Design an enzyme around this catalytic site. Structure first.
Site, mmCIF file in Angstrom:
data_model
loop_
_atom_site.group_PDB
_atom_site.id
_atom_site.type_symbol
_atom_site.label_atom_id
_atom_site.label_comp_id
_atom_site.label_asym_id
_atom_site.label_seq_id
_atom_site.Cartn_x
_atom_site.Cartn_y
_atom_site.Cartn_z
ATOM 1 C CB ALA A 65 -4.331 15.740 -8.563
ATOM 2 C CD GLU A 105 -6.082 12.351 0.118
ATOM 3 O OE1 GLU A 105 -7.077 11.599 0.239
ATOM 4 O OE2 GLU A 105 -5.221 12.218 -0.785
ATOM 5 C CG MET A 148 -9.150 -5.071 -4.241
ATOM 6 S SD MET A 148 -9.293 -5.551 -2.538
ATOM 7 C CE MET A 148 -9.547 -7.279 -2.736
#
Ligand SMILES: Nc1ncnc2c1ncn2[C@@H]1O[C@H](COP(=O)(O)OP(=O)(O)O)[C@@H](O)[C@H]1O
Ligand SMILES: Nc1ncnc2c1ncn2[C@@H]1O[C@H](COP(=O)(O)OP(=O)(O)O)[C@@H](O)[C@H]1O
Ligand SMILES: CCCCCCCNC(=O)CCNC(=O)[C@H](O)C(C)(C)COP(=O)(O)O
Ligand SMILES: CCCCCCCNC(=O)CCNC(=O)[C@H](O)C(C)(C)COP(=O)(O)O
Lengths: 267, 266
Positions: B7, B70, B123
């Site tokens: 997530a 992660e 971005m």
């Protein structure tokens, strides 16, 4: 009467040296014709050229002039400027933040280009215009100084929320990343301009700290006109260098490293 | 039924596994409440979580779940996928190009975060909106594909003119560098959008090729959803990696290396 000229993509840096008397003149690359007009008007003992548009001047000039590689000139002049300003650094990474950024490593004897990126002053001016429609340099940079990035940039802590992040939460996770969370709020040309300088700064510093690690050095010297009138970029760069366990350095007339270097390579 | 969930800041990657056949689900981080609702109604033997909003799910769920870093999960899932697809790379720099970019190094055993940058998909989406008032991802990414950067980006040859440059003249000298030379020409939302993706791509690749040199490796594996529907970014990245004497790699379901990794970890 000795003269060194670093004619870059955006600015022309002139360094006049008369009987140990340094002068630092700065005209736009846009107005190169006026620089050639001026140079033609007087007798110069020795003329030394460097940078992109150095050939342009050499072609349209009616006086002989030696031409040098900017990469070597910048390094020479920086050495001169550092030891003049009382810096006795064995080694360092030097970032020449001009129109674009050119990364170099100096090992106490010579330089070597170790990287480069297209995130420099040309991007501050370019993306700056597309986000503010301001064409004046001073105006664009000054506008940007007290701009807020909270509604624009996304931080590590914003993604990780309550969860413990694996890298500092205060760090920028995504530049312009917050823009789609603040569609309601008005994006001020100031706020937007601050964010341009922020990303340019963060990219230059990240690249600079990476090669500083690679060539096992803690000293990073930042040069180029991109630092002129942009105190925000200076702090952005300075603060991150420190946070990445490196020593940032700003030399006075550092954007003239090229021009100074040209004069002291001929002799 | 064993389930892994990455997530992130923008997307939730679900990889459910039932007897050697897989499922690759994508649901927005925006709609995390719906992901928890679904999971509560799902018969999960083993649950593994990773990424930013992994805690959010863990808090609101009525089933226990193992939480992983992660950085370690991505590395794990990536190698499973790499091997499966016939990539037996001794060492490799891996760029996880998500909302933001993180840069790792794998030495045939484990990974190490060696860098990171704020120039990712976030971005492309963020600066993309300020330059085109387009909020739809697909729309933003498809418009960019048929965009020209000549009037926007400045090349080394533009600065050096006729003079022989000290680095290839075709190279980008300054991103958006040309904008002030083309004030006459009006800047298409597509030309502008390609320039955003161009700079994001060029920054990720430059950083990736730098650490590839630093940790003495020629292999660079690019992952993350930022590559979805954005063929332009893929080519920008791919072409530069090659030019810098490196081997670029794109793994199938690479943006799931986090959700896959979580399952095959402990
Ligand atoms: N008066 C000015 N006019 C234009 N750009 C300026 C000025 N002062 C500083 N700059 C900045 O300097 C950048 C160019 O940097 P510079 O070191 O002169 O590079 P180059 O040698 O390639 O011309 C511009 O892109 C802009 O950010
Ligand atoms: N349908 C989509 N909607 C929004 N962004 C998408 C979509 N598909 C891919 N993306 C891209 O993927 C990026 C996020 O990548 P991702 O691998 O999910 O990283 P993170 O873990 O930070 O969410 C987005 O910023 C965007 O560029
Ligand atoms: C596909 C395009 C790849 C571009 C990646 C970025 C690499 N570019 C650079 O290293 C050039 C950066 N800028 C410079 O070197 C200076 O502006 C210079 C031209 C020397 C003056
Ligand atoms: C101004 C000084 C702070 C900004 C410097 C930029 C460095 N930022 C980073 O390395 C964060 C990059 N982002 C990521 O690694 C991912 O998107 C992640 C935070 C893990 C989610």
């Amino acid at each position: 009467m000795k003269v060194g000229i670093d004619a870059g993509g955006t600015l022309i840096k002139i360094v006049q040296e008369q009987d140990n008397q340094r002068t630092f003149k700065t005209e736009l690359t846009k107005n190169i014709d006026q620089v050639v007009e001026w140079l033609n008007q007087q007798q110069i003992e020795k003329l030394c050229l460097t940078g992109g548009n150095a050939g342009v001047i050499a072609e349209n000039i009616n006086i002989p002039a030696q031409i040098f590689v900017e990469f070597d000139a910048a390094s020479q002049g920086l050495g001169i400027l550092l030891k003049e300003q009382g810096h006795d650094l064995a080694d360092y990474i030097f970032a020449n933040v001009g129109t674009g950024t050119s990364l170099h490593y100096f090992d106490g004897q010579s330089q070597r280009r170790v990287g480069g990126i297209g995130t420099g002053g040309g991007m501050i001016q370019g993306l700056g215009y597309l986000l503010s429609q301001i064409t004046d340099y001073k105006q664009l940079t000054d506008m940007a100084q007290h701009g807020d990035r909270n509604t624009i940039d996304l931080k590590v802590r914003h993604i990780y929320k309550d969860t413990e992040p694996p890298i500092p939460g205060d760090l920028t996770a995504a530049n312009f990343g917050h823009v789609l969370h603040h569609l309601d709020a008005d994006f001020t040309p100031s706020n937007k301009l601050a964010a341009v300088i922020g990303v340019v700064g963060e990219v230059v510093t990240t690249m600079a700290i990476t090669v500083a690690r690679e060539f096992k050095t803690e000293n990073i010297v930042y040069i180029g006109s991109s630092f002129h009138n942009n105190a925000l970029l200076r702090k952005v760069v300075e603060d991150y260098t420190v946070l990445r366990g490196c020593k940032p350095y700003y030399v006075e007339n550092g954007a003239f490293s090229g021009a100074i270097g040209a004069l002291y390579l001929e002799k």
